[PDB]
């Protein structure tokens, strides 16, 4: 029931209207590495953004846009939500299935598992 | 009848069967790899995947070699770091100087790979090669100069999407991948080649040039033009999409979108 | 020098005609015979130097035709057809003089006999005779190293080649006669060029120290 | 020297810059070339500090000689591709030569 | 001195030939790996 | 070290790994192993330190 | 308990026939004693064969030396429902022998019955001995043979009556050399690129069409009827101990009278060179850096040769290799550097590709090679080719990139002295 909502200093509307996510990123399919899917994050719902007149350039009005936090376990961040009064959804961490990988089944004599070319 | 191995001494009990590589990845270790990829058939050529085993005179491709109990896996041995400085050296050797123009410039496989486990400097005094480039349609823009011969397009092609049409042809350092006609890889995955690539010889054509891969940001979300239900992350910078990517969900999309969805 | 990729020219395009003779395609037949059913694809190599020996050279359409009597992927009748170097993926002389510049061969003067081409021919390395009767091609160990220099032709090691040698056996070729295979020095094989310093007695015969338990 | 821009695109320089004052945009252009749609340095973030000099791989982005470019509007300090590819040709002949004096010592 | 007059199709003539006497294949099962 | 320090300007435009180090450094920068450390100067407005 | 080998009386020869003056066909294959009692050898049981190959101590003819019948005895095991093959390797592929070839060509009738006694070891249907495409004439020779062991029954349907069933198959290649590799030449006869396969998965376990298939020399399977007939300890007497039987060998270069003979193994090199090969061309004094087994293996100076035994162990010991047991000799009037850059150039041409440290180091190798014979280096390089040689070392899928490293490494360490000297008198020439 710990409630720093007050001692925060954040204004009332990001307090209530925004929805945080708790998740551990996926990996950037481009790449193999998996380091970057170690460790849960959380972020912020994302909010309106405009071109400035002038330039061009993304303008924004929204103060927590780029605030992302790392947690090492999901009731940490749980925790954090709660104690600063966020409404928070939690993604359940998902991990590469175990496979079964054979270099002899590439020359199978009787399965499909037989590859063309090397 | 899980069997007794030992990652860096560290006791891991594995199915037989499993390779080095999956019982280093019990442990964390994530052994360094460019033609390996879990989805598709193991192949060996790249050789980043060399490791010492304790007490064993030959490093041995820790994607292709099943383990046997008892062995001890030197991931960071004085021998494993040589033969991964050797394989990057060998494998920029004859690499683009293409970086500030190559899209998987920030998200390469291979320039990582360099920055962590390779060396800094080049001891390369001559030519490179260049390969002419291949068209294999409107999607997938081809600078095969960056090849590294990892075969994994061709292994995806064979394997995932059925098509065997991109292959090896030729030998030695000459050896190029790609159709040997003017064919065109037509299929509902073929996109999913731009992914699979380590490095940014095949890459999207729609996507070109129009952003760099620390800029954007990643918002995980569902596509809609199907209803697979595939899950992919969306990328968008200063608030305008910039490209779909296959997020990983082994029940429904194992790593892979669609042409429409992508 | 020759090129990985195929560009289509009305001589090589995908509607060049080319189909197997019905003895060839017995053969044809015969070869795939010999591997095992389910594995047809093993009479890829066969097959293509069917065709070759057919055409005298393998055009695209001579590789889709050998992929659809198979049943195999055409894209691996490319990779087969570029892998191995015999295949001829252009037309090529009615002759093909390939000399092996290797180091066994090398040391044996071999570069002389491969000069003595160049100058009877008017042809450079890697280049064909405006009669189109004589391609001139180095390459590696033919297997005859021992008796070198050695050049083969379409499917003839002519070796212990000395540069006369050579310019004879391309004017026989020229005029239409076929040279005899085999060393064009004294020696028949691999035997010393002096005399037999092994094997100069009879063969011992059958029965010769047979093990007793046997 | 033929006149085509030194940028390719990069946007490592962007990725450099310490106060986030170089937004570039980028397509491919008609020839088919890796060129920049939009290349904007905010003249009143920037810090001056002479990254994207020594970070911009093919020497597109310089650093000149001129320092009395002051404004009578905060606008005017907020350049454009165009004004910044107007600078380099104005000062193009200092440019080359004090490159050309400090590329050595680079 | 045999081998000096051998022709373009002789070894698959004789391959051709050979075929009646050779014994029958082994089957996979299957008609190939794609099938 | 090409991976702490960026490499040379002709190095960078000649070899492809001083190019990838270039690239990442000042794209990324270099990672630093982790951990904390107080570091003090004698600077000239007396000592002057960074907890980093 | 012989000290010095060297000297092998044609009675002990098993290649009779070897320089093809006797009939090659049935009948003078018969008359030489080939395809004498085979039967009874058929009968008497595949674990009777692969132990007199075992007590022969024969080690494979290849050139990886393997011993030859626990190799044999790894297909032993039980079948599993699935074919057996036997796979005869006559690639003959490396530059400098031609032993194979003349195996082949001359005496077809040794190698048939050595298939038919090795698959009865073996427990194998069929043996398919692939041979280069470029021995077209020895291949119509060999199938002439075997049309004349069909018509015969010594193969076939109850062969020699042993109520066994064998088929030899004569597989030709399409150029090139890597298809000597075991794993390549089962891939090439499957019909895909002669890529070689990752060993961790053996070729006695899966192999052709995903078979048990073990790949020999052509050699060592045709040395099989006669170890058979003979005896395991008659092969056993002949060489050192490990390095037992008499091996046929290639002398080519520069030599006086460029031959194959066949002699015991562990032959002095002097003895064999002067006795078979009529001596160096100008005398022993001008050898220089004679390359004991072939390319692959490692050259050797003449101060090593002059005393050195042909015999696996003992040219490990010299830093170099018996292998295919030819012998290139290269006279004092040779570039060394050209010719090691010219069969770096070979391996190469022959490189398959698949594997990076092969595919780009050989060629890198063989840029530094040419460079170096132009004399067009730095004299730091030498190391810097010393390290590249070995990261391709060791780390290849195929033994071609130690066959690659190998002669780098030792023109590297017998001849270092000329690399420099030529290197200093090229920038004295450009100044
Ligand atoms: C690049 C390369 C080429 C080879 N070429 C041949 C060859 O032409 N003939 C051969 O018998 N073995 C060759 N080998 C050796 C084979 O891979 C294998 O060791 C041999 O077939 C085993 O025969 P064995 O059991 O008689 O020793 C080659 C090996 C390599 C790495
Ligand atoms: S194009 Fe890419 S995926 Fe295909 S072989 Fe080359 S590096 Fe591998
Ligand atoms: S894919 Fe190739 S060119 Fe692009 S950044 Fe990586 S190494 Fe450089
Ligand atoms: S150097 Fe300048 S112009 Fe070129 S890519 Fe980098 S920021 Fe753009
Ligand atoms: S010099 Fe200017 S443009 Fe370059 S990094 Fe500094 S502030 Fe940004
Ligand atoms: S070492 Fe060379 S020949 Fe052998 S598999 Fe690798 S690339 Fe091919
Ligand atoms: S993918 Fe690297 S060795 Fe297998």
Known sequence: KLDITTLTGVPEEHIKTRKVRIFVPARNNMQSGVNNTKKWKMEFDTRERWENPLMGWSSTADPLSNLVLTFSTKEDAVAFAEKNGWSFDVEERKVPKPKSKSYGANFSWNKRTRVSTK | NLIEVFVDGQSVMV???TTVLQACEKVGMQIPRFCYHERLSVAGNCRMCLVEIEKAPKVVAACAMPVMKGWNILTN????????EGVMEFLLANHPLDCPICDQGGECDLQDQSMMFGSDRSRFLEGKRAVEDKNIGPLVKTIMTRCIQCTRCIRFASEIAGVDDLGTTGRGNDMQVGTYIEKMFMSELSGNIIDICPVGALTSKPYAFTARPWETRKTESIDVMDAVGSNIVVSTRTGEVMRILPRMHEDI?????????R | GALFVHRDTPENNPDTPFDFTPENYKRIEAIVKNYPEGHKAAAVLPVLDLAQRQNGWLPISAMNKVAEILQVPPMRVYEVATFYTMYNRKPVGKYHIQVCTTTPCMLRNSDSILEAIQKKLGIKVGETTPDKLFTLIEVECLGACVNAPMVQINDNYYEDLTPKDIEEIIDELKAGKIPKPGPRSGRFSCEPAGGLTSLTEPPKGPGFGVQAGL | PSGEERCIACKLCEAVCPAQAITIEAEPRADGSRRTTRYDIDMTKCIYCG???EACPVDAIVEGPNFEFSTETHEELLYNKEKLLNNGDKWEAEIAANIQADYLYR | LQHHEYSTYTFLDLNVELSKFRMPQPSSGRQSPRH | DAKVSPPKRAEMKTSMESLIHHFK??????????GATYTAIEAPKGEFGVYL | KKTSFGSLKDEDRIFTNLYGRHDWRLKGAQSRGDWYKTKEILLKGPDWILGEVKTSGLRGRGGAGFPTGLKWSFMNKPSDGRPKYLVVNADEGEPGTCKDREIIRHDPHKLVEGCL???????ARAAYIYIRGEFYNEASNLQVAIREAYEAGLIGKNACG?????????????GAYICGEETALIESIEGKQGKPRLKPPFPADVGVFGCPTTVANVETVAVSPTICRRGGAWFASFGRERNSGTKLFNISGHVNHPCTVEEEMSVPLKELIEKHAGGVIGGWDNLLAV?????????????????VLMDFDALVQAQTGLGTAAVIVMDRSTDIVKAIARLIEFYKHESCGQCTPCREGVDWMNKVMARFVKGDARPAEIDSLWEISKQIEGHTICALGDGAAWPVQGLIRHFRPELEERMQQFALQHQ
């Open chain 7, 291 to 307: 390359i004991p087994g072939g390319s692959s293996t490692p050259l050797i100076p003449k101060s090593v040769c002059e005393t």
């Open chain 2, 253 to 261: 999309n194992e790593e892979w979108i669609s042409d429409k969805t």
């Open chain 6, 25 to 34: 450094l000042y794209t990324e920068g270099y990672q630093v192993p982790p």
């Open chain 7, 162 to 174: 042993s109520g066994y069933d064998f088929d030899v198959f004569v597989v030709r290649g399409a």
């Open chain 4, 51 to 53: 990254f994207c000099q």
């Open chain 7, 117 to 123: 006694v090795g698959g009865r070891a073996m427990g």
């Open chain 2, 77 to 84: 041995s004085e021998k494993s770091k040589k033969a991964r």
């Open chain 2, 15 to 17: 199915e037989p069967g």
